[PDB]
Structure formats: structure tokens, C-alpha cells
Amino acid sequence: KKVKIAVDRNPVETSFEKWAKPGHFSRTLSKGPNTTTWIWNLHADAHDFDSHTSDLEEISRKVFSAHFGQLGIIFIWLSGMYFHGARFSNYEAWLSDPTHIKPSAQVVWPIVGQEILNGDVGGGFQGIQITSGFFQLWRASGITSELQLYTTAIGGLVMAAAMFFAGWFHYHKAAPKLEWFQNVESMLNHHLGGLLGLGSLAWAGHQIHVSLPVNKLLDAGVDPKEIPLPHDLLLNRAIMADLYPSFAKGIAPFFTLNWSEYSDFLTFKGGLNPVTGGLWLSDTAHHHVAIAVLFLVAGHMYRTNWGIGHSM
Amino acid sequence: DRKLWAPGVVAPEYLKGDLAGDYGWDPLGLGADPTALKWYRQSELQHARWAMLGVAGVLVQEIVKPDVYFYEAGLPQNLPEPFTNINMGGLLAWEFILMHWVEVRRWQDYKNFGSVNEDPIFKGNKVPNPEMGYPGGIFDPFGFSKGNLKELQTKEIKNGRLAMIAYMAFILQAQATGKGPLAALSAHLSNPFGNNILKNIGTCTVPHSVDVQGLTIPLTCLWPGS
Amino acid sequence: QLYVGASQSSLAYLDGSLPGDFGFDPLGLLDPVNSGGFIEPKWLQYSEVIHARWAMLGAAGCIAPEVLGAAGLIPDATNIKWFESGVIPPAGSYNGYWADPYTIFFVEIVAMQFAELRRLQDFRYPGSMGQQYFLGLEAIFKGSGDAAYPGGPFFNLFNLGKTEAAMKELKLKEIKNGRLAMLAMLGYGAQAVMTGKGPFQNLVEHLADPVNNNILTNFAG
Amino acid sequence: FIGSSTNLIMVASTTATLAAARFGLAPTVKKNTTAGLKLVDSKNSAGVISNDPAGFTIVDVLAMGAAGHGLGVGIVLGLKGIGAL
Amino acid sequence: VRPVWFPGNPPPAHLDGSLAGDYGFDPLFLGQEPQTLKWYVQAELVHGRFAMLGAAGIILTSIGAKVGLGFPEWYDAGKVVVEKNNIDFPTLMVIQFYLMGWAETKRWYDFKNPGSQADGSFLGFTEEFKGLENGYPGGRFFDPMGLSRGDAAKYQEYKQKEVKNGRLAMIACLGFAAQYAATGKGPLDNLADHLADPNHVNFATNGVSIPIA
Amino acid sequence: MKDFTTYLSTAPVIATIWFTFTAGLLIEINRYFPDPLVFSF
């Protein structure tokens, strides 16, 4: 196998000893300060890995675990936005009147008079009116409860710990070799296929099974505590057939290629939903389905270990 | 030691046939320590002898009277005529002290073999104790020992193990159907297809509590399901 | 080699030992050069064995209450499907156990931390598990060189496979029924999601009308 | 469905690719295509031990079954969109 | 060769078997330095001492409840003795802090200097506050029965038994608070609730321990 | 963890512990003593 897993076991010993020595990465900065330019060169040359060493394998290992550090920080960030949307928000109120209640997800502590920033955003709530658009994401995902926001915040903390452990593992315990990184055909096949293709197929699954029925019941006008939970939308095909009457035919039109019968919930409407001013979620559903098929086709392009495929 | 518990098994190293009833057994490693093996030998002898008493009590009390049932034979209502509705506290006091004597004498025979043989009140005749768990002397009033002690020792252990399985049978064929052992044997011999282990396991005829003169005893079966 | 789908790259090192070997490694996960982590060949063989015997216990145990209720040997209260046992309470929970399923689950937690961390500490530390006091029972747990096959006086009760060739045949046949039963568990789960019926009821419905009741006529047409 | 106008497109479009790659009319694992459009021998990057005489591996089966399903889905849905079936 | 908290894993290097109740349990390497470990041995001891006193306190005052005596529960005994007995509360707190600040700073400057606190600077006591080792002061006051001298092997046995009972009394005092923050009643009422029905009156049916009820 | 305590004694870590200390001291003061414009008694 030319394309194969190839790592190195225990390359870098996990120790706080080099945290005690600032400038350990640099040949010039390791002697310590004599001059305040040292402490700016410490922070400027900190992530310039190509100037630390000349070994491209070590540079690739450092930049592959720094990406797990960035991913763990993004999962801390996303999980914090879900947590602040759960515990400090008017999102429960915002779902009942999303035209007269301002989206707020940041509340300040009343100390030095800064509690004037807790303005009257509506829904019996005081906080800072957010503008990052998370409440519209959460309506488009079919959340309808701050319990789901709290649990995906806990899942984001778990996934951030997974990313931090992953960077620790793939730098300190089992770090990949150089010719692992140089398999760009396999990286493109897996990223077009698995990241982009399977990710939009999975979001197509969430849009077909969760967000289309929940947002259809919202647009018809139903209280969010009256809407069936989305696990009661997975298990009960009868509710989905009440909402979209081609779920009664099952996945039989998909394998008999009678896909036009799926036109109840995969559409090509275009324009806007006049109830809510957004895109039709059946249209975005068929969008991510077609994007998924396209990128799963595109991720079978490059030659890795069998003679089929292109080499770049 | 030979003719082990299964045909194709190698015996453990600590089971070379010195003890009686030795079948190359212990597939859970419990006798691997010698001081643990002597105590487990003593506890097997204790469970064997009390289980033989249990079997020869349960299948004799229904021979002499097949009306008083052995499960509730411990209730004061079911005791015989000179002991009916006795205070069970005083009876428990008699049993507690008269057993805390005997069992601690036997325990100190375990902890220091040979130091407990003399009658302590009557500083005279001892008990000739050849090996641990087999005192003799006055525990052989008929003198069936002082012959082939290994033969009768294997006989005692085999009848004792069979009586252990028999007595834990006698309880479980009485929790499922609420019926004595000879009476459950007669119930099998009546209809040997609906009065078996099938359609009797799963029910527990034991009540949850019985008030014995003011005390409630928890009274559990060994499997779930009433 | 056997099992077409095998390649030449998964055949040079892969010699003929390592029981259940047929060369079928089309991705080359088991490959000793530059390996590491959980893609070590020892961990992969060990986890195939563990997945194998858990799945064959599960493959007997999903089909057993429905078969034994088809014979009437167990009552109809315990004739339930495997996914309605309480493992998936959205699919259905049997309420006639002796406890809450979370009581039973905490008992399972304690029993399986003791069953599994001990199981791992002989993979990590092969000489261990007979050293500390564990109620005298540590004489069982000495194991052997191979972590997937300890074979003490308990794990190899009847001492089956005395000779080396019979032991290799038994290690082969265990993996054979284990791979068949891993596929059987995959075809219990994916076949109980799609149908909604038990595996034995799927077998009875396939033996009733094989053409009109199969995978093709189960897409709810 | 069996014998209908959509089954006959799908089977005859999958078996067409499975007979194309075997009989030298489509690229395989063992055989690729040059900078022009000429059918040339490969390196295969692992070596195959296929007992089949043309080296037609199961990887070729998956590749040309995916290609035949792609051509069949394209022809079936295009004939549904053109009106003629 | 000695028993470890997690069988298989070797004990760490700073934790050879010489302390009472040693089982190699330091995954976070907090007592890696010998002097910080010297301080945490003292801390584990005195937390165990107060937890053994506290656990015996809760268990005795809860045997006092539910049998028929007038004793309160342990979470109610703070109010009932400052209200039944006319006790001003912040002066009871300040008297506690005075007496125990004395008794604690004596120990705190025994740790900083082991031969100190014994020069008769106190009311004329020289050997009685000498201190035998870390967390085991001894002498005529802290060991009036004199069990730290005599048979030394039985004294090491008592050291390990003290540490064992202290560990599970710390666990019990962490558990009384959780039994009260979960159920809201007495600990020996929780025991009799677990004994009247062994199933269904455990922690998994309390609604608070597992949220997936 | 001697190297961890030397890391805890570096300049930015001492800076971010001491500034949280002197921040959360003045913040608790301005909670328990609201709005001090003038030195009162």
C-alpha cells in the first residue's frame, strides 16, 4: 500500500518542563531575556513552525495538532453559544412571537450601573440583543426547547475535549509521519467524500426528518410545546405521512427511482417562504441532497490504492 | 485423586489427593492458598454436616406428620404441643449461647490445632483429634472410626455434598410451588409434564412478611418473580 | 490466498498464523510497519475476538426469547422482541423486571468496570492479575501470553484444545462463528429498524412467501 | 417492478459497465488511460491476487456497479423528464 | 507486591509503602514533592479525624431520631440548640474560632518546625506537645492510653486502621450531604427506606441522581 | 509538578491571576459598597 497509515509512537514526551522554559522552540530565544525585544519575539515566533526546525515532518506534526487546538477552541465557542442560548435567553419566548421579541442571548451582572445594558428585548426578558443569528439557526434546526440547546452545549464540551485529546494524541503519543501528510489524493477523496459529501448527506437527513416537520408545524401555527419531539418524528411514520404524504411510501420511491413522488418535501420552489421570509426548507433539503450526491461523486476521483482514479 | 470432575482436565497442583473427595476441582482458584484451603475445608465439612441434618430433618418431619410444613415450621404456631407459642426470644437466647460456646471451641480448634481437646470443667479425659474437622473420642460413641478413616471420610463428603445440593433443592422446590420435597415428588409423579420445573419457575409462593410475635422478617426467594 | 478481495500488500507479512486469517485486509489496517495506537495488530486481533464473542452472545440472545416463546416454553410476557427489552425505551420497555432498568444498569456498571478494567489490565500488563489479592480468585486470572485467550482454570474449564493443532482449529472456529454472528447482529439491528419486527418473525415471514416478503418488498410499497 | 421499464434500464446499464471493464472497453484497477484516450497497464499500488483471468477484482465490481447505477439513474430520470417513460 | 488502588498499574515513584493506608492513589501527582506530600498526609489525617467525629455524630444523633427520642436530625441540630438553649450564635462561632485557632496554629508551627511547640513556652508542658511524627502527635495528652508506645507493629496496624476508617468516614460525610440534598430527610431514614424496599428506593429512583428517569 | 508551579509563576500567568484577584476584589467591594464617589464614614 502506497497510501497507508504511518505514524511514530511516542515522539514527544508529555511534560511541563518546557512550559517552564519560554523560548524552547527557538535557537535564539532559548537563552532567555536580556532585552524586552525577547518577549515580543517569543510571541511573534511562537507559531512560525517553519523557522523553528527544518524537518518538514516535525512542522507537519505541529501544524496538524495546532489544528486540533483550533478545533477544540471552536467547539468551546459553539458550545458556549448554545449554552448562553439555553440558560440566558428569551429563545423560548422568541419562538412564540419571532416578530416582536428581540433575540437576546447575553445578560450582564448588575454591578456598576452596567445593568442598563440589560434592555427590554421583550418576552419578559432583559439582556443584550444579539445579532449573530443563532436563534434563526435554532428555529431552522427545529430546536423548540432550551433542553436541546443545553444538551448540544454538553455535546460541544465533550467534542472540544475530544479535539484537545486528539491534538495531544497525534502530537505526543502517536504522531503521523511525513509521507502520511503527502497523500493529498487520499485527503481530497476523504474530504470531498466524507467531510463535504457525507456531512451534507447527514444534514440532509436532519433536514428531512427533523427540521422540515418541526418548521412546517411552526409555519402552520402550533405552540412549540405542542409540536411532537423529533424522536417521535423518527419513530412514527404516521406523523410524517400526516405532514408529508409521501412518507407513507417509505424509502421505496428512492430505490425504485420514483423520485418525483418525493416532491412533497424535496422541492425546487425558489424565492421565499411568505410565512416566514426565509428559504423553503424543502428546497434546502433537496439542495443538501444534491450537494451530497455531487461531493460523494467528486470524492471518488483521485487514485489512492487501487488503479482507478486520477493522480494530480 | 483420580477420576476427576471432567474427563479431560488436569488437576491443580494443590489437589494431589491428600484430602478426601478430591477431584482436581476448584475452577475458581479459591483453594490456591493453603491457609485458605484449610478454612474452606472446614466450611465444606460444616455445610455438609448441617446439610445432612437439614435433609434428614425435612424428609423425616413430613414422614412423621405430613401436615406441618417445613418452611413455616419455624413459626411459633407450628411448634409442637409442649412448645406451642413459646417466646422465640428466650429460645433464641438458649440457641445463641449454647452455639456460641460450641462454635468458638471449634473455631479455636481451627486457629490452634491441638490446644482445644480437654474438658475444661472436668480436667481429665481429652478428645483424641487425629485431623482437623474430625474430633472423635466422644463424637465417636460407636467407634466406627479407627479403621479405614479415608473410606468413611470420602463417604461423608460425598453424602454431604449430595445433601447440600439436596437441601438447596428442597428450598427451591418449596419456594416455587409451596410444597414439600416428598410432596413435590408426588406432585411430579401425578402429572409429570405440568408439575415440573416448567411453569413453576417464575412464581414465588413465599409471602413478603410474616409477623412472628411482633417482628417482620423480609422472607425473600432466591430468584425474582412472584 | 483465500477470500477474493485480498491483496498482495496484505499478504507478505500476513503469514498464516493469527487465527481466522484469510488475507482479507483490503485497507491494510493490520500492518506492523509504522503502526501505532489502536491500529496496532495486537489490539486489532484482540478487539475482533472481543467483538466476536460479545456479538455471538447477542446473536443467540436476541433470537432466544422469540424462538422459545414460539415454542411456548417461556410465557408470552417474556416473548418480547430484543429491542423492546428496555435497552431502547423509545422502542419499548419491559416493566416486569425486579427493578428499575437504571438500578439494573448501575449493577451492570459496577460489574462491568470490575469485569472490563481487569480485562484491560492483562492486555496492558500481561504478568498482572494474579499478583494482588482478589478473594483468592487471582489464581484464575494469570492468563497467558495472548490477551485474547487467557485460559485459566475457569476460562478453559474443560481444557478443550490440549494439542496445538486442535487449539488452532478451535481458535479458527470461534472467529468463524463470531464473524458470522457480528454480521448477524448487524442484520438484527438494520433489519429491525427497517421492518419493526423481530428476527425470528422476519425468518418466518421470509419462509412463508420468499419473493413477496424479502428485503425488496420491505421498503413499505 | 421486476421486468418494468425502469428495471430493464438499470440491469442493462449495470451489466453493460460490468462487461465493458472486463472486456477491455473501460478502465479497471489493472488498466488505466493515458494522456490521450489509450488503454494502458497500471501499477495498482498494492498488487491483486484475483483468481479471475483478466484480473477483474471486486474493486472493479464496485467501481463499475457505481458507474452503471449512475448511468442508469441518469437515463431513467432523464427519460422521466423527457416524457418518454 | 503491595496492594494498589488500581491493580496492574505500578505505584508512582514518590509513593513507596511506608505511609499508613498507602495504595498508590495519586493520578494527578499532587504529592510528588516530599514536603507537599508531608503537608497532605497531615491534611488527610485531620480531615479523616473530623470526618470520623462527624460521621459518629450524625449516626448517633440519627439513632436518637426515629426510635422515639427528642433528638433532631443533623441538618436541624444547628437551629434547635441555638434556639432551645439561649445561645447567641456569632459568639459561639468566635469562641470556636479562638479555641481552634489556638489548637490549629500550634499544629501549624509544628509542621514548620517539628522540634518546636515543646520548649515550655506554653503553660509548662515540655514533652506533652513534642510530636512523634507527621499527623501523629502523641504524648501524655494526645495519647493518654499510651497506644503509640509498646508494640510498634500493632501501632502501625492502628495507623492503617485509622486511615481506613478516616477515608470511609470522609466518604460518608460526603454522602450524608448528598443524601440530604437529594432526598431531604435523615440518613437512617434513608437506610430504612432502602431496607423496607431494596429495589425502587435507591438513588436511581430519586429523580435527582439520574436525570433520564 | 514543580515545573507546573514554575509555569504558574511566569509573567502572564501571574498577571492574569493577580489582575483577576485585584479585579474581583474591587468588584466584590463595589457590590457590597455601591457607588463610592466620596469618602464617607
Ligand code: CLA
Ligand atoms: C472521511 C474522512 C475524513 C474526514 C471527515 C476528515 C475531516 C477533517 N480533516 Mg482530515 N484527513 C483524512 C480523512 C478525513 N478528514 C485523511 C484520510 C487524511 C490523510 C491523507 C487527512 C489529513 C488531514 C490533515 C493533515 C488535516 C485534516 C483536517 C481535517 C478537518 C478539517 C477542518 C474542518 O472542516 O472541520 C470540520 C469539523 C468536523 C467535521 C467536526 C467533526 C469531527 C470528526 C468526528 C473528526 C473528523 C473525522 C475523523 C477523520 C474520523 C476519525 C476518527 C478517529 C477516532 C480515528 C476535518 C475535521 C485538518 C484539521 O483541522 O486537523 C485537525 C488538517 O490539518 N485532515
Ligand code: CLA
Ligand atoms: C459452601 C459449600 C462448599 C465449600 C466451602 C466447599 C469447599 C471446597 N470444595 Mg466443594 N462442593 C460443594 C460445596 C462446597 N465445597 C458442593 C455442593 C459440591 C457438589 C457440587 C462440591 C463438590 C466438590 C468437588 C467435586 C471437589 C470440591 C473441592 C473443594 C475444596 C477446594 C475448592 C475450594 O477452594 O472452594 C472453596 C469454596 C468456597 C470459598 C465457597 C464459594 C461459594 C461461592 C461463592 C458460591 C457458590 C455459587 C453458587 C451459589 C452455587 C450454587 C449451588 C446451588 C445450585 C445448589 C474446598 C475445600 C475439591 C476438593 O475436595 O479438594 C480437596 C473437589 O475435588 N468440592
Ligand code: CLA
Ligand atoms: C481531523 C480528524 C482526524 C484525522 C485525520 C485523524 C487521523 C488519524 N487518527 Mg485520529 N482522532 C481524531 C481525529 C482525527 N484523526 C479525534 C477527534 C480523536 C479523538 C476521539 C482521535 C483519536 C485517535 C486515536 C485514539 C487513534 C487515532 C488514529 C488515527 C490514525 C488512523 C485512523 C483510522 O484509520 O481511522 C479509521 C476509522 C476508524 C477506525 C473508525 C473510528 C470510529 C469512529 C468513532 C466512527 C466514525 C466517526 C465519524 C466521522 C462521525 C460519527 C458518525 C456517526 C455520527 C454516525 C490517523 C493518523 C489511530 C492511530 O493509528 O494512531 C495515530 C489511533 O489509535 N486517532
Ligand code: CLA
Ligand atoms: C440518454 C439518456 C438521458 C436523457 C434523455 C437525459 C435527459 C435529461 N437530463 Mg440527464 N443524465 C444522463 C442521461 C440522460 N439525461 C446521464 C447518463 C447522467 C449522468 C452523468 C445524467 C445526469 C443529469 C443531471 C445531473 C441532470 C440531468 C438533467 C436532464 C434533463 C434536462 C437537461 C437540460 O436541458 O439541462 C440543460 C441545462 C444547462 C445546459 C445548464 C447548465 C449550467 C450548469 C448548471 C452550470 C455549469 C457550471 C460550470 C460552468 C460547468 C463547467 C464545466 C463544463 C464545461 C464541463 C433532461 C430531461 C437535469 C435535470 O434533471 O433537470 C430536470 C440535471 O440536472 N441529467
Ligand SMILES: CCCCCCCCCCCCO[C@H]1O[C@H](CO)[C@@H](O[C@H]2O[C@H](CO)[C@@H](O)[C@H](O)[C@H]2O)[C@H](O)[C@H]1O
Ligand atoms: C448489503 C446491501 C447493499 C445495499 C442493497 C440496496 C438494495 C438494492 C437496491 C434496490 C434493488 C431494486 O429496487 C427495487 O426492486 C424491487 C423489486 O423486486 C422493489 O420491490 C417492490 O417494488 C414495488 C414497491 O416498492 C412493488 O410494486 C413491487 O411489487 C415490489 O416487488 C423494491 O421497491 C425496490 O427495492
